[PDB]
């Protein structure tokens, strides 16, 4: 129950249960090609009434950093704001855009602030942080514990194990940003309980030009198994 308490085995139980809230959110894919990084996720609604052009699971932090998550969107909107502030603090001091690793460190610090006090629960989200700094792509994975991992490809959320084996068997380097989007959508198609439309998913890419959330037209283009 309590968070400032170890078990005799030496485990933190509320953190393990906060990860269970990440393991039940919508899937999210991440692939790091040679000249870019892809972020894709399932954005599916419970009715035809929900306007999908109003909320976004893929969000920018800067011109060259972007996010997705698996789990709780209320928790996501806090870390989006915090990351956007920390990037601006870094810019205000150094007048250089923040590297993708320092943001992950400073954001895992925020996630760790919520693991040590009583009267606060941890975040029920994991993040995937894409970037393009120093002529190289980056992809990280921040957890509620305050721990981050650099990946070449991974998947979070529902069926995050088979979706990762699929990448282990269907991913290599010597790719580019267009061969990776096809692989990410194919990795999302495993868990898609229905017809995949341009409005049921959400895609964002980063490259030399910076981060951009693709449009439904571009999604419908590659949804035809095209490129």
């Amino acid at each position: 129950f309590s968070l400032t308490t170890f078990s005799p085995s030496g485990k933190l139980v509320q953190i393990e249960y906060a990860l269970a809230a990440v393991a039940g959110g919508a899937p999210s894919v991440g692939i790091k090609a040679a000249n870019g990084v892809v972020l894709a996720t399932e954005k599916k609604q419970k009715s035809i009434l929900y306007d999908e052009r109003s909320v976004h699971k893929v969000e920018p932090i800067t011109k060259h950093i972007g996010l997705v998550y698996s789990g709780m969107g209320p928790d996501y909107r806090v870390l989006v704001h915090r990351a956007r502030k920390l990037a601006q603090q870094y810019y205000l001091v150094y007048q250089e855009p923040i590297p993708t690793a320092q943001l992950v460190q400073r954001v895992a610090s925020v996630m760790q602030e919520y693991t040590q006090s009583g009267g606060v629960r941890p975040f029920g989200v994991s993040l995937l942080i894409c970037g393009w700094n120093e002529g190289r792509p980056y992809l990280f994975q921040s957890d509620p514990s305050g721990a981050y991992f650099a990946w070449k490809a991974t998947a979070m959320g529902k069926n995050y194990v088979n979706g990762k084996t699929f990448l282990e068997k269907r991913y290599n380097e010597d790719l580019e940003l267009e061969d990776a989007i096809h692989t990410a959508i194919l990795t999302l198609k495993e868990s898609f309980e229905g017809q995949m439309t341009e409005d049921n998913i959400e895609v964002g890419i980063c490259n030399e030009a910076g981060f951009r959330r693709l449009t439904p037209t571009e999604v419908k283009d590659y949804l035809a198994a095209i490129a």
Partner: peptide
Amino acid sequence: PAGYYCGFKAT
């Protein structure tokens, strides 16, 4: 009450 929000055509 949880902090979820979205736009709608009707609700």
